[PDB]
Amino acid sequence: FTVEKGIYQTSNFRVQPTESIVRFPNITNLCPFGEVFNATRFASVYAWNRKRISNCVADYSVLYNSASFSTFKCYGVSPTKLNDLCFTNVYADSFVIRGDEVRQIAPGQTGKIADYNYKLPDDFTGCVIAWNSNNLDSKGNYNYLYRKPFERDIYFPLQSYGFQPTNVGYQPYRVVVLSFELLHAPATVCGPKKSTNLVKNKCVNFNFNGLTGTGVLTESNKKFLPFQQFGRDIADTTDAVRDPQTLEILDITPCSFGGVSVITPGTNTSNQVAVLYQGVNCTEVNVFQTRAGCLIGAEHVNNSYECDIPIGAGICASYQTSQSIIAYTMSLGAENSVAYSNNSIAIPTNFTISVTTEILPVSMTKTSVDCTMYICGDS
Amino acid sequence: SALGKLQDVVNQNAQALNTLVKQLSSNFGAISSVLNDILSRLDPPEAEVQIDRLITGRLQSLQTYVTQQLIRAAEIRASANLAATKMSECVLGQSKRVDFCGKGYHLMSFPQSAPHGVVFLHVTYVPAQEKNFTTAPAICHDGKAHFPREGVFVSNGTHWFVTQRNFYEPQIITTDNTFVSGNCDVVIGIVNNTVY
Amino acid sequence: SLGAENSVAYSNNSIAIPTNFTISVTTEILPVSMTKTSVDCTMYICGDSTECSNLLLQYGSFCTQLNRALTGIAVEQDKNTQEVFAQVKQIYKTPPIKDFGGFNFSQILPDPSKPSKRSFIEDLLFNKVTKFNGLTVLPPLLTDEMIAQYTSALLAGTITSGWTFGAGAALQIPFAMQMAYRFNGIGVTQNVLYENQKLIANQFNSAIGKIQDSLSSTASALGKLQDVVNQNAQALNTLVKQLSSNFGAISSVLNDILSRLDPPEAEVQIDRLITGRLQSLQTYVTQQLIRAAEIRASANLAATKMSECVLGQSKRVDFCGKGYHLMSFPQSAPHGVVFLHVTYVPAQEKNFTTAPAICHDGKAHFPREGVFVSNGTHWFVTQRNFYEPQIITTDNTFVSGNCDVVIGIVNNTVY
Amino acid sequence: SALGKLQDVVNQNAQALNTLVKQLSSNFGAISSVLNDILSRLDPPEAEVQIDRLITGRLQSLQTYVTQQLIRAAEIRASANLAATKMSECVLGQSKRV
Amino acid sequence: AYTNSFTRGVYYPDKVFRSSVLHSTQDLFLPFFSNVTWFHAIHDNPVLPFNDGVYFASTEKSNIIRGWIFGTTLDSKTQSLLIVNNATNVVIKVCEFQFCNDPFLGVNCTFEYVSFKNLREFVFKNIDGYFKIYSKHTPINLVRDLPQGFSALEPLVDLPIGINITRFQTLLALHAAYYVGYLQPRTFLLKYNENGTITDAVDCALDPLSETKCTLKS
Numbered sequence A: 001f002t003v004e005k006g007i008y009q010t011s012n013f014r015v016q017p018t019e020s021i022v023r024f025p026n027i028t029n030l031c032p033f034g035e036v037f038n039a040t041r042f043a044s045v046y047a048w049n050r051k052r053i054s055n056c057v058a059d060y061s062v063l064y065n066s067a068s069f070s071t072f073k074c075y076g077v078s079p080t081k082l083n084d085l086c087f088t089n090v091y092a093d094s095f096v097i098r099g100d101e102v103r104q105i106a107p108g109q110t111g112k113i114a115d116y117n118y119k120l121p122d123d124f125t126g127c128v129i130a131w132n133s134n135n136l137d138s139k140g141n142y143n144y145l146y147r148k149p150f151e152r153d154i155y156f157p158l159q160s161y162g163f164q165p166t167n168v169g170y171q172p173y174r175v176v177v178l179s180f181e182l183l184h185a186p187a188t189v190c191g192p193k194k195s196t197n198l199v200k201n202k203c204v205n206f207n208f209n210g211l212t213g214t215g216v217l218t219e220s221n222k223k224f225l226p227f228q229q230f231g232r233d234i235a236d237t238t239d240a241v242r243d244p245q246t247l248e249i250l251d252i253t254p255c256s257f258g259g260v261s262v263i264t265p266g267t268n269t270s271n272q273v274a275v276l277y278q279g280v281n282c283t284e285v286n287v288f289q290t291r292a293g294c295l296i297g298a299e300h301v302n303n304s305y306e307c308d309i310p311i312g313a314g315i316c317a318s319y320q321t322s323q324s325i326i327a328y329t330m331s332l333g334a335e336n337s338v339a340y341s342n343n344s345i346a347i348p349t350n351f352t353i354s355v356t357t358e359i360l361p362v363s364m365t366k367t368s369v370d371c372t373m374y375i376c377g378d379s
Numbered sequence B: 001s002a003l004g005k006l007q008d009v010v011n012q013n014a015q016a017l018n019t020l021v022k023q024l025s026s027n028f029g030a031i032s033s034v035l036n037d038i039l040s041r042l043d044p045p046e047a048e049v050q051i052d053r054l055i056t057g058r059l060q061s062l063q064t065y066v067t068q069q070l071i072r073a074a075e076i077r078a079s080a081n082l083a084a085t086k087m088s089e090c091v092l093g094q095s096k097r098v099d100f101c102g103k104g105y106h107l108m109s110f111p112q113s114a115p116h117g118v119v120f121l122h123v124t125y126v127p128a129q130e131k132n133f134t135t136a137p138a139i140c141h142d143g144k145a146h147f148p149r150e151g152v153f154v155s156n157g158t159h160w161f162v163t164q165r166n167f168y169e170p171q172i173i174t175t176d177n178t179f180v181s182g183n184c185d186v187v188i189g190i191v192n193n194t195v196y
Numbered sequence C: 001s002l003g004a005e006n007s008v009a010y011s012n013n014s015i016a017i018p019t020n021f022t023i024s025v026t027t028e029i030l031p032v033s034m035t036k037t038s039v040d041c042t043m044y045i046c047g048d049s050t051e052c053s054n055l056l057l058q059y060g061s062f063c064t065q066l067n068r069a070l071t072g073i074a075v076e077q078d079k080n081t082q083e084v085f086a087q088v089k090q091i092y093k094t095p096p097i098k099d100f101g102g103f104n105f106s107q108i109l110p111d112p113s114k115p116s117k118r119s120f121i122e123d124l125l126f127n128k129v130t131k132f133n134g135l136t137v138l139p140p141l142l143t144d145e146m147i148a149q150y151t152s153a154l155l156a157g158t159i160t161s162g163w164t165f166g167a168g169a170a171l172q173i174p175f176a177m178q179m180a181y182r183f184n185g186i187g188v189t190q191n192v193l194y195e196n197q198k199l200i201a202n203q204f205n206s207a208i209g210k211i212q213d214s215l216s217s218t219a220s221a222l223g224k225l226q227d228v229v230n231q232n233a234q235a236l237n238t239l240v241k242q243l244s245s246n247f248g249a250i251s252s253v254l255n256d257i258l259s260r261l262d263p264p265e266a267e268v269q270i271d272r273l274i275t276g277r278l279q280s281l282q283t284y285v286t287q288q289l290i291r292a293a294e295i296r297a298s299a300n301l302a303a304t305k306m307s308e309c310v311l312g313q314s315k316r317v318d319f320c321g322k323g324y325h326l327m328s329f330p331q332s333a334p335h336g337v338v339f340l341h342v343t344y345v346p347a348q349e350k351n352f353t354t355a356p357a358i359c360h361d362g363k364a365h366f367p368r369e370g371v372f373v374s375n376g377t378h379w380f381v382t383q384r385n386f387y388e389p390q391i392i393t394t395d396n397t398f399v400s401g402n403c404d405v406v407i408g409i410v411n412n413t414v415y
Numbered sequence D: 001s002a003l004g005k006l007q008d009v010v011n012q013n014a015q016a017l018n019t020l021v022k023q024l025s026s027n028f029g030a031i032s033s034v035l036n037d038i039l040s041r042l043d044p045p046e047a048e049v050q051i052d053r054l055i056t057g058r059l060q061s062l063q064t065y066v067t068q069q070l071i072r073a074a075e076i077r078a079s080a081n082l083a084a085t086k087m088s089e090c091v092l093g094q095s096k097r098v
Numbered sequence E: 001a002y003t004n005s006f007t008r009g010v011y012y013p014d015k016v017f018r019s020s021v022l023h024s025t026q027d028l029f030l031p032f033f034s035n036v037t038w039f040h041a042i043h044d045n046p047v048l049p050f051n052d053g054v055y056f057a058s059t060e061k062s063n064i065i066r067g068w069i070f071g072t073t074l075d076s077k078t079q080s081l082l083i084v085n086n087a088t089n090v091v092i093k094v095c096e097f098q099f100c101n102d103p104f105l106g107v108n109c110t111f112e113y114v115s116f117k118n119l120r121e122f123v124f125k126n127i128d129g130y131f132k133i134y135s136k137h138t139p140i141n142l143v144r145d146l147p148q149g150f151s152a153l154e155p156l157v158d159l160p161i162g163i164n165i166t167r168f169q170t171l172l173a174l175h176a177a178y179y180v181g182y183l184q185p186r187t188f189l190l191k192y193n194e195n196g197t198i199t200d201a202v203d204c205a206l207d208p209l210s211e212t213k214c215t216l217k218s
Ligand SMILES: *[C@@H]1O[C@H](CO)[C@@H](O[C@@H]2O[C@H](CO)[C@@H](O[C@@H]3O[C@H](CO)[C@@H](O)[C@H](O)[C@@H]3O)[C@H](O)[C@H]2NC(C)=O)[C@H](O)[C@H]1NC(C)=O
Pocket: A349, A350, A351, A352, B128, B129
C-alpha cells in the first residue's frame, strides 16, 4: 500500500487489433462428398479406393450433423473447426469392414486389420466416418474379402466376408476415412468461410487460408517466387504472406508492444506519477519522447541536475518545483578547468581529517530446506 | 538509507523464501494444490498422476530457488572476500592503494560489526587550502643543477624555497635539501637562485 | 615451446644494472557492462493467447521471478558502468595551450571536430566492435557521449594534476614535474627525467603512435568485448529458436494448435508447449545471471584498476602492465574500458662487480640508497635501476659496525 | 589435511560425475529405466510416452549438472584470478599489502 | 561412364520464402562431386532403379529427350506413370500402358493431365505416394560434362500417383547425353541472398571442413 521512490515495471503495452481480416480463395466449387459417402458400391478393404479431393469448397457441417453416421471420430483436428481452417487437399478412403473392427481403424492400433490390409499412421490427421449398411450390403453377400500406413495389397491369406441381415457385431459397416495434410503449401480445399476486404497499415487479425495471426499488413518489396505462398522468420512465425485472391505480397509486422514503467516519488511525498512506455513512439499511445520510449506526465526541463530516477539514454526524472515530475538530461558534474601552466603549482596550506563509512555484506541467513517435506510433506 | 547494502540482501533472501512458499499453492495442472485433498479424493491410480504433476512443479520450484541461492551466495562470498581483504590491508595496516580505503590519503580504519556485515570507518588525510606558486624543476647555483631531495621548489613571487609535496612548509634552499647532478644546460626550465 | 631458454649469469659478486630505459605504453581491455535485455512472460511463452495465458497462470510466479532477475541484471549493468567511470567529482578540461613538456596526448584527448567528443583512439575502438517475441533491449542509462565525458574528465585531471585530483581537490603541476614524481615513485631519481625529458617524450609519443597503428591494423585486440557481445547475441538467438520446437506437441504454432483442436486437447498441446518454453526461459535466465556475475567481477576489477592506476601510481606488480608503472590513461570502449598503461622498462644493462659493503678505517660502509659497483678499477655507488656512478662519500653511505662481520666486504676509500 | 582445498575440488567434481551417472538408473515415472528394455517391451505408441518420461528426467539431470559446473567454474576462476594476482605481486615482486 | 556432379542438383526444399539467412535442410539432395552415371545418345535407355529418390540432368541441343516413365514392371501389369513432352504440350498419364520391348519415340486409367546449349535439370521422388518434380533451365556453352557453377531448381508439379516406382526410364526421339544422379537424405546448408535466391550451399557430409561450416552455421 506504500510505494517507495523509483521507477517500476508494472504492465505491458499492446496495441489491440481493430478488425479481423479473412481471406480465402474465391472458388465456388463444391467438394464431391455425395459421390463418396452416397456411392452405390464400396470397394473392399484390400482394395480400398483413394478418392482425390481438391479445388473445391468443403462443408463439413452437414457431414458432422448428419445423424446417419454411427461414429464420427476426428483425431488430429476438431470436427467443429473443420470449416474455418483448410487444407491443400483431402483424401477419402472408402471401404467396408467387419463391424467389431471399427476400433482397429485408429492411430496406434494393432490387429488383423490394422497391420495387414489397412494401417493408419500414428501421425494421422483426419476424420473417420463409419455407419452400418445392413439394409444395403447384407444379403448372403460374399463380395467383401480381406488379405506401412496407407498400403493396398492387391494356403491363401484371403478369406471372404458373408454378410446377411440376420447377423450387431458381425454386421457390415460402411466407413469413409478422410485424410488431411497440413504442410504449408497453396491450399485448394477450404471451407465455406466468406472472405472479406483487406486493410493495410492497421493492426488487424488476418486469416490467410487458415493461417491466423495478428499484425500490421503493409506493402512489401520482397520478391516471392510463384510457388512461394508464405514467408517465415527465424522464430518460425510468418513474416510475409501472399494474398490468396490477388497475387500480391504483404509484410506482416506485429502490432506495437512494450513494457509500461511508472515513475513515482514515494506516496509519503506525493501521489503524482509519470508513465514511461518503453521503446514506443509517441503515436501508438505534456508528452516527452525519449530514446527510452514515450514519457507521459513528466515536464521536460532544459536545466540539468544530478540523476534522481533513472529512465535511460541519459534522461532522469525527479519530483521538484507547485511541485511536479520533471524530465531532464542528467548532469555529469560541475565543470572545472584546472589552471594548468608549465611553471605553476598548487600546494595545500592546510588539511582536514575525514572519516567516511564503507559498508559491506559479509554473510546471509543460513536457511535449510527440507526437500522431501517441502515437496511431499507427511505423504 | 545508509544500511541499504545489508537491507537489500535481507530483503532478497526473505523475498526468495516467500516466493518458494507461495509456489506451494499452485496447481501445476493438477486438480488441486493440496496433497491431502488429492489423496483423500482419488484412488491411487489417479492420485499418482495428480501427485506427479505437483511433484514436477514443486521440484522445479526448489531447483530454481537453489540456483538463485547459489548465485547470491557466490556474490556474498565475493563481498566477504573483499571485506576480509579490506580488514587485513586497511585496519591491520596502512594502505597505499588509491580509493581502497575511502577518498583521500588513507591513515587508518576502524571496524564496526553490522548485522550480516561489517562497517569500516576510514580515516583519511585530505588537503584543504591550496595556494598558487611559481615552481621550477631545478636551480642553478654555480653552473650546477640542484634538485630537491624531497619536495619541490616554490616561489612566493620574489624568493625561492623548498617545501614538501602535500603541505606548504617553505624552507631555505640549502645543500642539505638538494642534490647536485650535472650542469645548467640540460634541464628544461631551470632557474637561477643561491643555494645556501 | 614454453619460451626461450635463458640461464642468468649469476655469481656471488656480479650485478647487472641498466644504463638506459624505454617508455612502453601497453593496452589492457576489460568488459564493464553487457546488453540490458528484458523478456516478457506471456508474449514469449503464450503470445496474444488468452487460453495459453490462463494455462500458464497455473504455474504461479515462475516467470515473474524471471522478470525480476532480468530487471536486476539490467540495473546491475548501469551500476557497473557508474562504478567504473563516475569516479571523478568534477568535469575537468585541459587548457587550450597543450604545453605538457613535449608530451602530446593529442590522440587520446577529445576531438572537438566530431559530433561526439571522442578521441582518435576511442573512435578506433568504437569502429572495431560490432526481437518481436517479448524480447526488448533497454538503453543504458549513460550514453556513449557521457562515458566519453567521464573519460575526458579523468584524463584531463590526470594530465593537469597528477594524483591530487583523485585524492582531494585538483592541484595543478607541470607535467614534467609530475613525471619526475612518478620516476621518484619507481626508485629512479628525478634528475634522470629532467636530463632525458626529450628522449622520454619522444618514446611516449612513439608508443602512442604504435598503439594507434595496432588498433587500426589488428581487429582481434577487442576480442574480450566482442566475446561478450557474441555470447549475448547468441543466447538471444537460441532463445528465439527455441520457439520453433514442438516439445512433443502436434505443432509449434500456438495459433495453429488453437484453430485446429477443441479446448480439451488444445490444453494438452498448449501445456506441452508451455513446459518447453518455460524451461527455455529458465535456462536463458540462469545463463544470463551467471554471465552477469562474471561481468560484474570484470567491472569491479576495472573500477579498481581505474582508482589505483589512473587516479594514482600503483606499486603492485603487473597490475598496470609489465614494468614499473608510471601512469595510466582510460579510453571508453563499447561496453568496456581500455587502459593505456605507461610503464618504465630498463633497456641496456651492463655487468658490474658489486660488494655488500666497503672497509675504510676498520669501519663498514653501506649505501644509503643504491649499490656499490666497480668498473674493474674504481668503486662507485649508483642507484638500483639506472647506472649513474658517483664517488663513494660519507654523504652516500652510512657506517655500522666493523669489517669482521659482513661477508663479501671489500677495501676502498670513502671520500 | 594441508591440501584440503584441492582435494575438495577433486571430490566435488568426482561426486558430480557420479551423481550424473546414477541419474541414469532412475525411472522418472517410467515403467523401466532401461531404454532397450522399454523398446523391446511395448509398441511405439506407448514406448513414446515411456521414452519421453525418461528423456525429460535425463535432460533435467544434464541441465542440473551443467548449472552446478558453471557455478563451480565461476568459483574456480575467481580462485585462479587470485592465484595469478598473488603470483604477479608476490613472487615477481615484494608486496606491501598486509 | 562416370563423372562428378560438381555443385549441381540443388533445389528449394519447400515453398517458403527466406532472405539473407543460412537455412539447414534435411532433404534428398545429390552429394557434391558425386559419381553420376553418363549415358550416350549417339551412333541408351537401360533399366534404371529408382531407390529412394532420383535426380536427372539433360544437356540438350535438339530436344531428343522428351519424356520419362515410372513403375515396377512397365509391361501393363501394373500402373505406370508416363510423362511425355512433345512440341508445346506436356502430357501426363498414370495407367497400364503396354510398352514395347525397347520403348522409344519416332521422329484402367486413373489420372491424366495435358498442358550442348541447354540444361534441363530435374528431380523425381515419391513421398507417401506423392510424386514431386523439381526443375530449372540454364544455358551453358559446353558439351563434354557438367559445367562448374551453382544454380537452384524450383518445383513445378505435385502428382499424387501413389504408384510403386522401383524403376524408371527415359524417352529418346530417334530420327543427347543425359545424366542420372541419385538423391540421399543429406543435410545442406542453404545460403539465401537478399532476394531469396540460393546463391551457395554446403554439403554437411562432404568433408570435415563442410561439417565445421554446418556446425558453425556459416
Ligand atoms: C586549518 O583548518 C582548520 C579547520 O579545519 C582551522 O581551524 C579553525 O580555525 C578557525 C579560526 O581560528 C576557528 O574558528 C574559531 O572557532 C572558535 C571556536 O571556539 C570561535 O570562538 C572563533 O570565533 C572562531 O570562529 C575554528 O574553530 C578552527 N577549527 C577547528 C576544527 O579547530 C585552522 O585555523 C586552519 N589553519 C590555517 C593555517 O589556515
